[PDB]
Amino acid sequence: LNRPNMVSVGTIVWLSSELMFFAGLFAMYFTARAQAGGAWPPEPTELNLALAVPVTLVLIASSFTCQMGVFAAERGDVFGLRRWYVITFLMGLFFVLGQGYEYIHLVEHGTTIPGSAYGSVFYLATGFHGLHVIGGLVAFVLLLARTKMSKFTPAQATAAIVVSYYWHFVDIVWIALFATIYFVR
Amino acid sequence: MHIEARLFEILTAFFALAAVVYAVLTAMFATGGVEWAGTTALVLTTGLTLITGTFFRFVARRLDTRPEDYEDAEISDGAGELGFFAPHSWWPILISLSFSTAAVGAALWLPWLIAAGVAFVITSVCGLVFEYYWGPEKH
Amino acid sequence: TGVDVEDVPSAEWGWSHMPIGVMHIGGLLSAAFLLVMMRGNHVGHVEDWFLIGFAAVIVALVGRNWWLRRRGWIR
Amino acid sequence: MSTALTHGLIGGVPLVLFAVLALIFLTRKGPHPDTYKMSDPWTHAPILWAAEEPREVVIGGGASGKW
Amino acid sequence: ELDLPYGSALTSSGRISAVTEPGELSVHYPFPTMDLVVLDDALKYGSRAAKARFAVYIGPLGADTAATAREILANVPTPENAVLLAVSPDQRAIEVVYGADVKGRGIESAAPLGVSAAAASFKEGNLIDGLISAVRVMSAGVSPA
Amino acid sequence: ELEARRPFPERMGPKGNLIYKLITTTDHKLIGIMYCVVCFAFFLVGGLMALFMRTELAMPGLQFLSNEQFNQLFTMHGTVMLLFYATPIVFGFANLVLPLQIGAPDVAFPRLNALSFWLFLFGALIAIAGFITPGGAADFGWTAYSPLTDAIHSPGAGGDLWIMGLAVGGLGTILGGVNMITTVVCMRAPGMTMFRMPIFTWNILVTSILVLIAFPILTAALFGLAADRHLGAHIYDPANGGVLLWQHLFWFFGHPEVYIIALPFFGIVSEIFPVFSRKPIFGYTTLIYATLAIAALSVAVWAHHMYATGAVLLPFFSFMTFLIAVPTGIKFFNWIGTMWKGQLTFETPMLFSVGFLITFLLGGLSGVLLASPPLDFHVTDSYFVIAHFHYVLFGTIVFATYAGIYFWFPKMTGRLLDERLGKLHFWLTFIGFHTTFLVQHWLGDEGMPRRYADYLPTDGFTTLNVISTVGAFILGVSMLPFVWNVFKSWRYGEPVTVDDPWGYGNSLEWATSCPPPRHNFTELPRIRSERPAFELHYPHMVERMRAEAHVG
Numbered sequence A: 001l002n003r004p005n006m007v008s009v010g011t012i013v014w015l016s017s018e019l020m021f022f023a024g025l026f027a028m029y030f031t032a033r034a035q036a037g038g039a040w041p042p043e044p045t046e047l048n049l050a051l052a053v054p055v056t057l058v059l060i061a062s063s064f065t066c067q068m069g070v071f072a073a074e075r076g077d078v079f080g081l082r083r084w085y086v087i088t089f090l091m092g093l094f095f096v097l098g099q100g101y102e103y104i105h106l107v108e109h110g111t112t113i114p115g116s117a118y119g120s121v122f123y124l125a126t127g128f129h130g131l132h133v134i135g136g137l138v139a140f141v142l143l144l145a146r147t148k149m150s151k152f153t154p155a156q157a158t159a160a161i162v163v164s165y166y167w168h169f170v171d172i173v174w175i176a177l178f179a180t181i182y183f184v185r
Numbered sequence B: 001m002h003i004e005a006r007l008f009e010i011l012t013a014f015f016a017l018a019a020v021v022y023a024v025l026t027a028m029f030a031t032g033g034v035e036w037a038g039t040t041a042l043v044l045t046t047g048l049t050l051i052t053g054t055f056f057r058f059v060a061r062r063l064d065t066r067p068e069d070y071e072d073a074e075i076s077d078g079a080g081e082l083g084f085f086a087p088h089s090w091w092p093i094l095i096s097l098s099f100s101t102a103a104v105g106a107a108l109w110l111p112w113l114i115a116a117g118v119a120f121v122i123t124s125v126c127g128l129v130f131e132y133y134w135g136p137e138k139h
Numbered sequence C: 001t002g003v004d005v006e007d008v009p010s011a012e013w014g015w016s017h018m019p020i021g022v023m024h025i026g027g028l029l030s031a032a033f034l035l036v037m038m039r040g041n042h043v044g045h046v047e048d049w050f051l052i053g054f055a056a057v058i059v060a061l062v063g064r065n066w067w068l069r070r071r072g073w074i075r
Numbered sequence D: 001m002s003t004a005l006t007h008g009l010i011g012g013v014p015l016v017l018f019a020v021l022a023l024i025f026l027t028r029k030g031p032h033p034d035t036y037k038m039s040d041p042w043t044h045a046p047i048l049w050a051a052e053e054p055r056e057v058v059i060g061g062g063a064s065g066k067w
Numbered sequence E: 001e002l003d004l005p006y007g008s009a010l011t012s013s014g015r016i017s018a019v020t021e022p023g024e025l026s027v028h029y030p031f032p033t034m035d036l037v038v039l040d041d042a043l044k045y046g047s048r049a050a051k052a053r054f055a056v057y058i059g060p061l062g063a064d065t066a067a068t069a070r071e072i073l074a075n076v077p078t079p080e081n082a083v084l085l086a087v088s089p090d091q092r093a094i095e096v097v098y099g100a101d102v103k104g105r106g107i108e109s110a111a112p113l114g115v116s117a118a119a120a121s122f123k124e125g126n127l128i129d130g131l132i133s134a135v136r137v138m139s140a141g142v143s144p145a
Numbered sequence F: 001e002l003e004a005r006r007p008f009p010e011r012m013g014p015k016g017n018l019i020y021k022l023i024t025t026t027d028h029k030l031i032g033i034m035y036c037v038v039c040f041a042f043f044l045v046g047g048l049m050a051l052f053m054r055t056e057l058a059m060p061g062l063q064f065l066s067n068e069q070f071n072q073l074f075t076m077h078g079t080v081m082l083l084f085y086a087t088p089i090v091f092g093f094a095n096l097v098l099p100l101q102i103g104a105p106d107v108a109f110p111r112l113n114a115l116s117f118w119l120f121l122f123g124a125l126i127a128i129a130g131f132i133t134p135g136g137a138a139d140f141g142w143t144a145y146s147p148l149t150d151a152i153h154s155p156g157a158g159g160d161l162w163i164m165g166l167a168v169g170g171l172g173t174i175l176g177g178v179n180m181i182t183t184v185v186c187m188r189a190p191g192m193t194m195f196r197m198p199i200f201t202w203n204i205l206v207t208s209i210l211v212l213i214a215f216p217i218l219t220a221a222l223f224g225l226a227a228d229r230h231l232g233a234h235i236y237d238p239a240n241g242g243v244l245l246w247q248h249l250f251w252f253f254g255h256p257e258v259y260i261i262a263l264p265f266f267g268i269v270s271e272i273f274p275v276f277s278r279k280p281i282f283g284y285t286t287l288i289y290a291t292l293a294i295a296a297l298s299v300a301v302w303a304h305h306m307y308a309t310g311a312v313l314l315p316f317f318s319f320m321t322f323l324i325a326v327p328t329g330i331k332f333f334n335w336i337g338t339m340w341k342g343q344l345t346f347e348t349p350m351l352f353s354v355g356f357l358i359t360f361l362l363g364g365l366s367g368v369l370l371a372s373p374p375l376d377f378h379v380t381d382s383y384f385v386i387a388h389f390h391y392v393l394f395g396t397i398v399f400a401t402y403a404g405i406y407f408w409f410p411k412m413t414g415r416l417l418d419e420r421l422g423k424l425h426f427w428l429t430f431i432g433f434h435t436t437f438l439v440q441h442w443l444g445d446e447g448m449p450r451r452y453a454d455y456l457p458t459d460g461f462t463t464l465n466v467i468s469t470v471g472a473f474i475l476g477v478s479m480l481p482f483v484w485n486v487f488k489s490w491r492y493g494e495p496v497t498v499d500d501p502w503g504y505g506n507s508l509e510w511a512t513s514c515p516p517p518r519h520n521f522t523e524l525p526r527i528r529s530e531r532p533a534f535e536l537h538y539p540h541m542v543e544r545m546r547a548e549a550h551v552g
């Protein structure tokens, strides 16, 4: 029975809704850029492309690690699943820490949320994505803990798969945000 | 799953047409140029429909006909064993109470209440996720 | 004492019955207290509405229960 | 203007309309059948009513009467 | 009508699936609702206290009335523990029949009392009132055993 | 021989039968009942707010209210009526009758179902708990426009609670939509194809897609507004395009919303008409295609709420709205062609459906008139708009909801509502509504804008306000027969020992017991058309049904 997977359908449609949420955020950002004429990144702001690219590379690497974990999960092997998902969790935590460090260095040199119109849209566009990353990390921890406490079944496999493409959605959203904020300007 | 994919593909086509038409017609003939809000909204609505329709198309392209997708199917064709459907549970109301606590702590700016609500949300979601997987107690 | 096992399954395992006169008199005295709380230094009248409404609801509930038990519709 | 007039209308027209429509409708006849009179013959089908209460053919007695 | 009368149909199981027209009822009892409710309450709370089913029959007994009554009692769910009261308002006959398990529990000194109450109430034309009175007195008579 | 029944069914149920089941239940039928009850309670509180508004609006001058109090009153009335009654009553009806209509035993995610219900309830409570604040509830409009909602203007704590309650409720609604989509996609009987399912199911699927499109962008806008109000975040600053940004976002959410609260009720009346006309539904595929067309077009007209700002491209949105006006007319003609040449009997659901037809027709005429920008230039933000959307909203939501209750009360309880009380209720509601909301067209055409707490005697409009208040009090006294009928008929009332108490029923819900069992079915009939219960209960009609299915 169960020719298509039901948790998969649910996760896909919910990911679509979250795409609409990020649509709202992108609209907020794209407006008020057309109002800043000239040096539209204002008085004190300078983005650090020497630190923005490594964290993106780590995020893509984590996506690849998660896909490898999915491959390990499709065959009834739980230990490879665990290894690859621990690696993915660590890479994601490193991304989050790098983003926080960039936040600190950017806030102690000017740009703040109540300081300018650019700081507000920048911080809201990136912080909600960071929150989604933290949610994905929590999901990873819960999935691993659940694998520890019962026999490995196709339901466990399905859980791994749906968590994986949630992570992939987060990664593609970050790619869009990065391309929009650091290159297009 | 042909009709679901076809529905979402029709929606995608119409949304993409409307998006591109609105984009170019605000690039011209508008008081300030591109509108930059409705354009983004329509583009990412098209993206929503595209994601869902593409997933459904990929599922349908590698699946045998189901008893509910085939007329002249018999009710004894679906005989078997369906999935697992949860009986009674009390975790949803606790999840809702935790989320409401965090929401009240955000409405009235109280970071201690926000943190308590977040911790309660984590705890109750853990309880919901582990409910049918805890083993017997090890004594 | 005892109630029916068809109303309280574990009636033989613990205290399961409380007489209805206690509840009726308690409700009436609660309403009386709510009413008597209109004596003091409470200038303004937005709270008298709450007191009167809460007492009226309780009296109506007690009266409904007493009537339906007197006429046999419950019990 | 006409404070008393507006008050009277606002407070009275809904009640009058309610009463009229209630008289028109609630005085009609319901679909419930008429009560059986013991003078006419029993025309309904036979009825058997049980108690359902005790949850889980040799006769042991009897008694008779003729009103 | 014994062949699924115009709306009823046999299903994949042995269950029937009947219908009704948009303005019609499907019970057709020539008694008030608030009298059927009192009879149901009496018939339930007497059986609960007596630990024995109580049943009521209203149709005809156009034969040996005792034989028909004790052939009717065999339709009660648990006939070996049951007390049935049958009334014919055309032949004007009242008959109470028992079971084996309900015997020596106060059944002999309560059946004539039930018949007497039912008759005394039927001599004015109160069928439901007579039934309720008879059920009350017989239920107060029988004891749980 | 004989068969042993009870003199009367059991009235209520044993002690302790509901309270713990109510906290731990995962049964979609009980969840739908809870939806319905809580939604009607919120309807009552919103109606009380409207009654206060009417009684102040009569008799020029401020008699007992204040300006701030009147503002809070219309804000909270609009908010409660639009988001705490209609949007959750949609999912109440869905949870009631969708798995039965597709032949399923249960919904896809039964714990997510309960989570959606509880999120709705607690979000509504959070949003409404602003009246106990010394500043009062929210006092900007229901639309909460751009610079008025910042922290300098409207600095009270009611707006914060408003925002957070809306966010909680929106998450609940999104989860409900996900559940419904997945249920229709996966759980489905082994003979029911997608072009054999009911129009109510089709409309619910479309409404769920619209929900998934519309609600997340409102959540994003609310989070941006909270960021402003609590951190000084320059996002809706008028030095930017912050004034028009908020309007664009909010109306992109808000028009799909008014289409979210219409299509399930179109589906309800399209399920009700054929049963009481003893005919098939006219143009099954045409109705499906009209629903899809409305769903598609509803996401490109949002700016017809922004004609007077002087910042939108008028012809695009005007053409889109004129276009969206056509599938509704096709749907109306299908509903009429269903009743044409039948055997019509008018019980309470059919009566309420005809009232719906009339009222919605007039409201839609007003709307398509309102869709012209030159005319909107005069009649916008007046009582003409109020009259229009009250006609459409009342006609669809209130009338189709009452029709659905009168229709499906037996299928959920095993009892019948009284019909004389239903006729009294219908006529009270009809007279009251057409007395209170007809003169407002004139009221708004002559200069009288919306959201005014007071006016002057030297103006006109002092008799029409009194007439509208009289009608409003009639509408207020209309609810007592309905409430009394439900309260009595739940416990007493004619029992239903059959399937289909309204004979000639379709849609596979009338082919199971009157109160359905847990998992809803003990047997399923062969599925060949969209009328399986009809083909099951009248087997001699299949030949006559297929022979003449195309004459017209």
Ligand code: HEA
Pocket: F142, F143, F258, F259, F261, F262, F304, F305, F321, F322, F324, F325, F326, F328, F329, F330, F332, F360, F361, F363, F364, F365, F367, F368, F370, F371, F372, F376, F379, F380, F381, F385, F389, F392, F393, F396
């Ligand atoms: C269920 C709710 C609902 C529904 C169904 C509708 C349906 C429609 N609405 Fe309405 N509308 C609202 C609720 C609704 N509306 C609300 C709540 C507001 C304002 C909220 C706020 O501002 O507070 C609003 C505001 C609103 C405005 C802006 C008014 C203003 O702010 O000034 C406009 C104008 O473009 C409009 C137009 C329409 C049109 C064209 C339809 C069409 O769907 C109607 C089509 C109906 C018909 C019956 C046509 C069918 C066709 C035929 C029958 C053939 C004949 C055709 C012609 C006559 C040419 N609506």
Ligand code: HEA
Pocket: F043, F044, F045, F046, F047, F048, F050, F051, F053, F054, F074, F075, F077, F078, F079, F081, F082, F086, F141, F142, F143, F386, F393, F394, F397, F398, F436, F450, F451, F452, F453, F472, F475, F476, F477, F479
């Ligand atoms: C579906 C949604 C909905 C519904 C059903 C209603 C129902 C009613 N509305 Fe409302 N209305 C709106 C949605 C709705 N409205 C919206 C969106 C606005 C614009 C919002 C904005 O301005 O911000 C609006 C604005 C609005 C105004 C303009 C206020 C202002 O701008 O000045 C007026 C006044 O004439 C009005 C009147 C009514 C009346 C008389 C009813 C009647 O149908 C209701 C009468 C019903 C009852 C009276 C209930 C019965 C009450 C009791 C019996 C009390 C007993 C109950 C308990 C004890 C708790 N409405």
Ligand SMILES: [Cu+2]
Pocket: F255, F258, F304, F305
């Ligand atoms: Cu609109």
Ligand SMILES: [Cu+2]
Pocket: F308, F381
């Ligand atoms: Cu305006």
